[PDB]
């Protein structure tokens, strides 16, 4: 299976990604890398493995489905058959994620459903949980909210920040996307016609 990646910054998803898919047993390739920001270190990390970039600034659009049309047309031109965002920060448009329904999966760094949103992490401690976690899900239109494919339990340790946490969490998330895009490229784990997870 073909694989986009989409990114908005540091990419050390992305990373863990191109390691686990350049495995022997890999059933997915990487095919292209998108970021809608420039000069984001993530773009480095792929240019070192050799892999196509391309950079779709979503400030030079009208709206999000002319960002989300860009998007795909690149998509499209490489023959994507899923797509993985990995710190990607954009809310993508109602038909974007229709046409890509059961073929695009996220990485959330906390265990959905708690702390939906952008500053998972905050939201967290503000609320002093002492498990968190992080969670691949499916992407459906409500965001945050598709079906969940893995998840991993964190520990949150006393005095820990958005930096000391974040770093463990994305220790674990850097096992379950590689994991998930394995389980979804395989055809292990599939979105049902009712809408639910199926394992095969
Ligand atoms: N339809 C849909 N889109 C999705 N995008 C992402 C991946 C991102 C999930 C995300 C969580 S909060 C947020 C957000 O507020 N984005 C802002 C930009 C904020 C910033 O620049 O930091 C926006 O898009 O206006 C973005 C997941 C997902 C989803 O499940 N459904
Ligand atoms: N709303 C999505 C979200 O908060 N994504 C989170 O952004 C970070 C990106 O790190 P990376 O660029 O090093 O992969 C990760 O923690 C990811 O789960």
């Known amino acids: ?5 989409l990114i908005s910054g540091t990419g050390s998803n992305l990373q863990a990604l191109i390691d686990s898919t350049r495995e022997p047993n890999s ?11 420039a000069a ?4 480095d990390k792929a240019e070192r493995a050799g892999i196509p970039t391309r950079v779709i600034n979503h400030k030079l659009y009208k709206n999000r489905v002319e960002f989300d049309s860009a998007i ?17 920060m954009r809310i993508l448009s109602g038909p974007f994620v229709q ?18 949103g952008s500053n998972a992490h905050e939201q967290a401690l503000e609320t002093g949980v002492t498990v968190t976690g992080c969670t691949v899900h499916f992407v459906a239109e409500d965001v945050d909210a598709g079906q969940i494919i893995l998840q991993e339990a964190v520990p949150v ?4 920040t958005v930096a000391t946490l974040s770093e463990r969490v994305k220790l674990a998330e850097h096992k ?21 997870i199926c394992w095969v």
């Open 176 to 196: 379950i996307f590689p994991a998930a895009l394995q389980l979804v490229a395989s055809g292990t784990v599939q979105l049902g016609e009712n809408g639910k």
């Open 72 to 88: 795909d047309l690149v998509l499209e031109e490489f023959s994507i058959d899923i797509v993985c965002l990995a710190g990607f």
């Open 99 to 116: 046409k890509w329904n059961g073929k695009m999966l996220n990485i959330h760094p906390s265990l959905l459903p708690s702390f939906k």
């Open 40 to 43: 984001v270190a993530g773009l």
């Open 27 to 37: 059933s997915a390739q990487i095919d292209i890398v998108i970021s809608n920001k």
């Open 1 to 5: 299976a073909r694989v986009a990646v």
């Open 157 to 160: 340790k006393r005095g820990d």
